[PDB]
Every structure is written in structure tokens, then in C-alpha cells.
Design a protein around this nucleic acid. Structure first.
Ligand SMILES: [K+]
Ligand SMILES: [Mg+2]
Ligand SMILES: [Mg+2]
Length: 272
DNA sequence: AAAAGCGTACGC
DNA sequence: AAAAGCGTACGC
């Protein structure tokens, strides 16, 4: 049987409907049960958000800094819908704690908890299934670890790394995200370098650490000039996007005792 | 011009 | 509340 790890806040938006009125807390938990059955899960762990990553904030103070601006500029109707939706999501998450191992850690993102759980107990299961729409969770794909997205309704396997993210493997995916950044997370990338130029540069010169050694790179294009002045940006971004490497550091950032407790809690779940 | 990179609206 | 989301289509 399998392990299933749910990105719970991410999953909540499956029930955001501008037209619908009623609570979804019971239907939220039933959906997780249904997913558990679809992915043959003997163990399901649900993860929630609880603040911006203290780790990522320490390396990039503007991490998700667009949030408070984006939420301030919502219309009257959007604010009213959101306040209902988020009240309902809180109740859904409460009700979920009755039934499944359900984790928040203050100042730690679900991403880091998921990455750590996979490495900690994933080998005790036949397969691990990740329930998230978030594409950078594919930094955790292996032959034994896959992802399902409710928005796209797609399954994502390691063999399909290229078809999805236009890269060969996890390391290339990490290198490309570090170069490109992520506007949604307010992580600046190298100006003028997107997916096409980024992949072309990675395939020629290698992964981000190799590219930094060779700086300045040759070429007279404006985006290469921007790349050659971006050493500090590239190192910083690598720490922000390399989920497998820094997941434990991200949990430890909020306290050694928090890491200790979470480690024990996860190992106890696997024994049940 | 063209593509690329870029910015934004919206469904679930 | 340093609360509170993703990918996608789409147009310049
Ligand atoms: K179209
Ligand atoms: Mg998240
Ligand atoms: Mg995104």
C-alpha cells in the first residue's frame, strides 16, 4: 500500500465557488478519503499553511511580499467571498484533524514538511502520492514518488519531467527555477530569461552551480549581461527553490525542538 | 516583424 | 496577522 501527502491549503481552493453558498468542511474531508482510496493509501498525511516560510524570509525578505498588496486591492465582492471561503477552510481543516494525521508548523511551509516526510518514511511504502497543484513539488518526483493535481486533473511521474517542465531531471528543474525565479512568490529571476533561453543556457553550460563558476558567460545579448551580474541572485534563489536540499533547514529555522517533535510525530504515524 | 518574456484575469 | 493559491489562457 501507499503513502499519500496532501497539500491541504492548496486543496481547499477546489471548493472556492463565487456562486455556491454552503459549508464544504465535510465534503473536503470526504474528498481526501476518496483520494486515499484512488491512490491505495494505508497512510494519509494532510499538511496546512501557517505563515510565510521563516527560512525563505531570512534569505529573501520580500518572499511573497506581493501578498499583502494583492489582498488589499481586492474589490468589495471579492473580500466578502474570500472571508466566507477562508472561514470555511479553517473549519474544513479542523474537521480533517479528527480523521487524518494533520500538520501545521508555525513559520514552516507545507513544501518543506512534505519533502522531509517523503525522505523520512517514503521507503516504508510501495509508492508515495503527493496531492498538490503546485508544480515545484515535482522536485520530489522519483520512480516511487508521483503527484496528482485537482485543477489540471493530471498525474505527474518522473518519466514525464520533460513533457511537463521542459527539463531532463530534478536538478535541471531546480536550476531553471533559480534562473527564472517565480513572480507568484515574489522571487525575481534574471531579467530577460524565461523557459526557452533558460533551458538553452542550462543544456549548454550546465546547472546553476556550474554556471556561477563560469561567470561571466560569453555572448552580447542583454539577457546574458543580466545573467553575468546575477551571481548573488542565483545563489539566493537556489536556496529558495531547492526543496530536497533545504527542507530540514527550513523546519529547523523555527526551532530545534519543533524539528525534533515533527520528526518523532512522523515516525510514529508510519508505525500505525 | 517575429518570438520571447512578461503581466494579468479567472476557475477550482 | 511577514493570515490568505495554484496553473492556465491570453494579449502585448
Ligand atoms: K484560444
Ligand atoms: Mg503552498
Ligand atoms: Mg506559479
Amino acid at each position: 500500500r501507499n503513502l499519500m501527502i496532501v497539500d491541504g491549503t492548496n486543496l481547499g481552493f477546489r471548493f472556492k465557488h463565487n456562486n455556491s453558498k454552503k459549508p464544504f468542511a465535510s465534503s473536503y474531508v470526504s474528498t481526501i478519503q476518496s483520494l486515499a482510496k484512488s491512490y491505495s493509501a494505508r497512510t494519509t498525511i494532510v499538511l496546512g499553511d501557517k505563515g510565510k516560510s521563516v527560512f525563505r524570509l531570512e534569505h529573501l525578505p520580500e518572499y511573497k511580499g506581493n501578498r499583502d498588496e494583492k489582498y488589499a486591492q481586492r474589490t468589495e465582492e471579492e473580500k466578502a467571498l474570500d472571508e466566507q471561503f477562508f472561514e470555511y477552510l479553517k473549519d474544513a481543516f479542523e474537521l480533517c484533524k479528527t480523521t487524518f494525521p494533520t500538520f501545521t508548523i508555525r513559520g514552516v511551509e507545507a513544501d518543506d514538511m512534505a519533502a522531509y516526510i517523503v525522505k523520512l518514511i517514503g521507503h516504508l511504502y510501495d509508492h508515495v502520492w503527493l496531492i498538490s497543484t503546485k508544480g515545484d513539488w515535482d522536485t520530489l518526483l522519483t520512480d516511487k514518488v508521483s503527484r496528482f493535481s485537482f485543477t489540471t486533473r493530471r498525474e505527474y511521474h518522473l518519466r514525464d519531467m520533460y513533457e511537463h517542465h521542459n527539463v531532463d531531471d530534478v536538478e535541471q528543474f531546480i536550476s531553471l527555477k533559480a534562473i527564472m525565479g517565480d513572480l507568484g512568490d515574489n522571487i525575481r529571476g534574471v531579467e530577460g530569461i524565461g523557459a526557452k533561453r533558460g533551458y538553452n543556457i542550462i543544456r549548454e553550460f550546465g546547472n546553476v552551480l556550474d554556471i556561477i563558476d563560469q561567470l561571466p558567460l560569453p555572448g552580447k545579448q542583454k539577457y546574458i549581461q543580466n545573467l553575468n551580474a546575477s551571481e548573488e541572485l542565483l545563489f539566493r534563489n537556489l536556496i529558495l527553490v531547492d526543496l530536497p536540499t533545504y527542507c530540514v533547514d527550513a523546519i529547523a529555522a523555527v526551532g530545534q525542538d519543533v524539528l525534533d517533535k515533527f520528526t518523532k510525530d512522523i515516525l510514529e504515524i508510519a508505525e500505525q
